[PDB]
Design an enzyme around this catalytic site. Structure first.
Site, PDB file in Angstrom:
ATOM      1  N   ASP A 119     -61.370  46.737  36.562  1.00  4.92           N
ATOM      2  CA  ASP A 119     -60.131  46.470  37.211  1.00  4.92           C
ATOM      3  C   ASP A 119     -59.098  47.053  36.954  1.00  4.92           C
ATOM      4  OD1 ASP A 119     -59.174  45.174  39.218  1.00  4.92           O
ATOM      5  OD2 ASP A 119     -58.707  43.231  38.288  1.00  4.92           O
ATOM      6  N   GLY A 179     -49.481  35.635  35.058  1.00  5.97           N
ATOM      7  CA  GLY A 179     -50.606  35.952  35.871  1.00  5.97           C
ATOM      8  C   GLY A 179     -51.620  34.925  35.586  1.00  5.97           C
ATOM      9  N   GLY A 180     -51.978  33.962  36.475  1.00  6.19           N
ATOM     10  CA  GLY A 180     -53.179  33.004  36.516  1.00  6.19           C
ATOM     11  C   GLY A 180     -52.509  31.707  35.458  1.00  6.19           C
ATOM     12  N   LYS A 237     -48.853  33.311  30.386  1.00  4.79           N
ATOM     13  CA  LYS A 237     -47.508  33.608  30.065  1.00  4.79           C
ATOM     14  C   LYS A 237     -47.182  34.646  28.797  1.00  4.79           C
ATOM     15  N   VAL A 238     -46.149  35.463  29.195  1.00  5.11           N
ATOM     16  CA  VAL A 238     -46.047  36.710  28.231  1.00  5.11           C
ATOM     17  C   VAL A 238     -44.451  36.530  27.645  1.00  5.11           C
ATOM     18  CG1 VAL A 238     -46.230  38.970  27.384  1.00  5.11           C
ATOM     19  CG2 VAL A 238     -48.016  38.240  28.776  1.00  5.11           C
TER      20      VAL A 238
HETATM   21  C1  LIG Z   1     -50.454  37.231  30.981  1.00  5.82           C
HETATM   22  C2  LIG Z   1     -51.260  38.050  32.203  1.00  5.82           C
HETATM   23  C3  LIG Z   1     -52.141  38.906  32.133  1.00  5.82           C
HETATM   24  C4  LIG Z   1     -53.420  38.272  32.387  1.00  5.82           C
HETATM   25  C5  LIG Z   1     -54.755  39.141  32.458  1.00  5.82           C
HETATM   26  C6  LIG Z   1     -54.570  40.602  32.044  1.00  5.82           C
HETATM   27  C7  LIG Z   1     -53.447  41.165  31.492  1.00  5.82           C
HETATM   28  C8  LIG Z   1     -53.373  42.774  31.670  1.00  5.82           C
HETATM   29  C9  LIG Z   1     -52.682  43.259  32.805  1.00  5.82           C
HETATM   30  C10 LIG Z   1     -52.268  40.379  31.865  1.00  5.82           C
HETATM   31  N1  LIG Z   1     -50.865  40.780  31.102  1.00  5.82           N
HETATM   32  C11 LIG Z   1     -50.672  40.994  29.967  1.00  5.82           C
HETATM   33  O1  LIG Z   1     -51.528  40.681  28.949  1.00  5.82           O
HETATM   34  C12 LIG Z   1     -49.056  41.407  29.699  1.00  5.82           C
HETATM   35  N2  LIG Z   1     -48.317  41.595  30.684  1.00  5.82           N
HETATM   36  N3  LIG Z   1     -47.300  41.999  30.166  1.00  5.82           N
HETATM   37  C13 LIG Z   1     -46.250  42.503  31.236  1.00  5.82           C
HETATM   38  C14 LIG Z   1     -47.487  42.515  28.889  1.00  5.82           C
HETATM   39  C15 LIG Z   1     -48.741  41.896  28.508  1.00  5.82           C
HETATM   40  C16 LIG Z   1     -49.056  41.977  26.844  1.00  5.82           C
HETATM   41  C17 LIG Z   1     -48.331  43.069  26.079  1.00  5.82           C
HETATM   42  C18 LIG Z   1     -46.775  43.252  26.474  1.00  5.82           C
HETATM   43  C19 LIG Z   1     -46.010  43.854  25.662  1.00  5.82           C
HETATM   44  N4  LIG Z   1     -44.828  44.147  26.191  1.00  5.82           N
HETATM   45  C20 LIG Z   1     -44.459  44.252  27.396  1.00  5.82           C
HETATM   46  N5  LIG Z   1     -43.222  44.230  27.929  1.00  5.82           N
HETATM   47  C21 LIG Z   1     -42.805  44.642  29.466  1.00  5.82           C
HETATM   48  C22 LIG Z   1     -43.833  44.804  30.240  1.00  5.82           C
HETATM   49  C23 LIG Z   1     -43.442  44.957  31.780  1.00  5.82           C
HETATM   50  C24 LIG Z   1     -41.937  45.055  32.052  1.00  5.82           C
HETATM   51  C25 LIG Z   1     -41.511  45.189  33.446  1.00  5.82           C
HETATM   52  O2  LIG Z   1     -41.969  44.560  34.299  1.00  5.82           O
HETATM   53  N6  LIG Z   1     -40.213  45.492  33.616  1.00  5.82           N
HETATM   54  C26 LIG Z   1     -39.658  45.509  35.087  1.00  5.82           C
HETATM   55  C27 LIG Z   1     -38.676  46.689  35.339  1.00  5.82           C
HETATM   56  C28 LIG Z   1     -38.344  46.996  36.551  1.00  5.82           C
HETATM   57  N7  LIG Z   1     -37.515  45.695  36.666  1.00  5.82           N
HETATM   58  C29 LIG Z   1     -36.820  45.846  38.412  1.00  5.82           C
HETATM   59  C30 LIG Z   1     -38.426  44.548  36.981  1.00  5.82           C
HETATM   60  C31 LIG Z   1     -39.156  44.420  35.437  1.00  5.82           C
HETATM   61  C32 LIG Z   1     -41.028  44.837  30.922  1.00  5.82           C
HETATM   62  C33 LIG Z   1     -41.446  44.579  29.515  1.00  5.82           C
HETATM   63  O3  LIG Z   1     -40.442  44.708  28.516  1.00  5.82           O
HETATM   64  C34 LIG Z   1     -39.633  43.797  28.385  1.00  5.82           C
HETATM   65  F1  LIG Z   1     -39.741  43.094  27.267  1.00  5.82           F
HETATM   66  F2  LIG Z   1     -38.273  44.267  28.238  1.00  5.82           F
HETATM   67  F3  LIG Z   1     -39.272  42.775  29.246  1.00  5.82           F
HETATM   68  N8  LIG Z   1     -45.340  43.507  28.582  1.00  5.82           N
HETATM   69  C35 LIG Z   1     -46.679  43.063  28.021  1.00  5.82           C
END
Ligand SMILES: CCc1cccc(CC)c1NC(=O)c1nn(C)c2c1CCc1cnc(Nc3ccc(C(=O)NC4CCN(C)CC4)cc3OC(F)(F)F)nc1-2
Length: 263
Positions: A139, A26-27, A30-31
Site C-alpha cells: 500500500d 488517520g483511523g 493521531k500524530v
Molecule cells: C497516524 C496515521 C498513520 C496511520 C497509518 C499509517 C501511516 C503512514 C502513512 C500513518 N501516518 C503516520 O504515521 C504519520 N503521519 N505523519 C504526517 C507523520 C507520521 C509519523 C512521523 C511523522 C513525523 N513528522 C511529520 N511531519 C509532517 C508531516 C506532514 C506535514 C504536512 O502535511 N504538511 C502540509 C504542508 C502543506 N500545507 C498546506 C498542509 C500541511 C507536515 C509535517 O511537519 C510538521 F510538523 F511541520 F507539521 N509527520 C509525521
C-alpha cells in the site's frame, strides 16, 4: 493560533514531552509534534487500542517489532526512538520531518531531476530492506514517505490493520485488482516516480474508479510514456509498469539500473 496547542503535555516511558501541535490523523491514530525535556523535536504517534480485537493488536505488535528491528538496517526507514505499549494505547516516539512526500509533490510544480533521482534511491533502499525481511508493504503511496533533511524515510511497513473510525487506487497493481509479491511494491513505486516525472499518476486522468480498475488490468490500454531527456528514467518507468509481475523489474535489478548508477 488554532493549529498550535497550548499547555498540553504527555509521558512515554516516564519521559515528559510537551505537545506543540497535532500534525496528523488517520483511523484511530493521531500524530503530534512534541519537544522532550532537552528541547529536542519528535513526532509522537498515538494509536488508540480500546476497540481493537486480538488480530488487530497482534498486527500492531508485529509492526512495532519489525520497525524497531529494521531501523538498524537502513537510515531510509524512520527512527523509532521509544514506545509505550499498554492495553489501551501505543505511544511511538519517532523522527520528526518537515513534510511528507505527498504534500511536497502537491506544492512543487517542477521537481529537479537530481532531486527526483535522489528520492528514487531513498525509496528503493527503504523497500529493498523490508523485502529482505519478508515484508511486502502492498500500500505504498507518497504519503508513506517523510522528508527529513532532504532524505526520504519510509514511515510504515503496511503490517498493522487500519482501524475504521480514504485509500486511493491510483497506486494499486493489476494483480491486486485480479484477487502478495515484492513486485506489487515495484508497481506502486513506479507510479510515485511516474508522478515525479510527468506530474500525475499513470491513470489519474480517469474519473470513474471502475473504469480506472479495468484500465489498470486491460492489456490493450497502453500507458503513455512521453519522450524526456532522461532515457534511463523512461526505461525505469516502462519496466516498473509491466502488468505481468513476472515480467516487471525487481528491486535488486532496479538498484543496478543505469538510471540509479550512471552519473
Ligand atoms: C497516524 C496515521 C498513520 C496511520 C497509518 C499509517 C501511516 C503512514 C502513512 C500513518 N501516518 C503516520 O504515521 C504519520 N503521519 N505523519 C504526517 C507523520 C507520521 C509519523 C512521523 C511523522 C513525523 N513528522 C511529520 N511531519 C509532517 C508531516 C506532514 C506535514 C504536512 O502535511 N504538511 C502540509 C504542508 C502543506 N500545507 C498546506 C498542509 C500541511 C507536515 C509535517 O511537519 C510538521 F510538523 F511541520 F507539521 N509527520 C509525521
Amino acid at each position: 493560533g488554532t493549529e498550535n496547542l497550548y499547555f498540553q503535555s504527555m509521558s512515554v516511558k516516564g519521559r515528559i514531552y510537551s505537545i506543540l501541535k497535532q500534525i496528523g490523523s488517520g483511523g484511530s491514530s493521531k500524530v503530534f509534534q512534541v519537544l522532550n525535556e532537552k528541547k529536542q523535536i519528535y513526532a509522537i504517534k498515538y494509536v488508540n487500542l480500546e476497540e481493537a480485537d486480538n488480530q488487530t493488536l497482534d498486527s500492531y505488535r508485529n509492526e512495532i517489532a519489525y520497525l524497531n528491528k529494521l531501523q538498524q538496517h537502513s537510515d531510509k526507514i524512520i527512527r523509532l526512538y521509544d514506545y509505550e505499549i499498554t492495553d489501551q494505547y501505543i505511544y511511538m516516539v519517532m523522527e520528526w520531518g518537515n513534510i511528507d512526500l505527498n504534500s511536497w509533490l502537491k506544492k512543487k510544480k517542477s521537481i529537479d531531476p537530481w532531486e527526483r533521482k535522489s528520492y528514487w534511491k531513498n525509496m528503493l533502499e527503504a523497500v529493498h530492506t523490508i523485502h529482505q525481511h519478508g515484508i511486502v508493504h502492498s500500500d505504498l503511496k507518497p504519503a508513506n514517505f517523510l522528508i527529513v533533511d532532504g532524505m526520504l524515510k519510509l514511515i510504515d511497513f503496511g503490517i498493522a490493520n487500519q482501524m475504521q473510525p480514504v485509500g486511493t487506487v491510483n497506486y494499486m497493481p493489476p494483480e491486486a485488482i485480479k484477487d502478495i509479491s515484492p513486485k506489487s511494491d515495484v508497481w506502486s513505486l513506479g507510479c510515485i516516480l511516474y508522478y515525479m516525472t510527468y506530474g500525475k499518476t499513470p491513470f489519474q486522468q480517469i474519473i470513474n474508479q471502475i473504469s480506472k480498475l479495468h484500465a489498470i488490468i486491460d492489456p490493450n490500454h497502453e500507458i503513455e510514456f512521453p519522450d524526456i531527456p532522461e532515457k534511463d528514467l523512461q526505461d525505469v518507468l516502462k519496466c516498473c509498469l509491466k502488468r505481468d509481475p513476472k515480467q516487471r523489474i525487481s528491486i535488486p535489478e532496479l538498484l543496478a539500473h543505469p538510471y540509479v548508477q550512471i552519473q
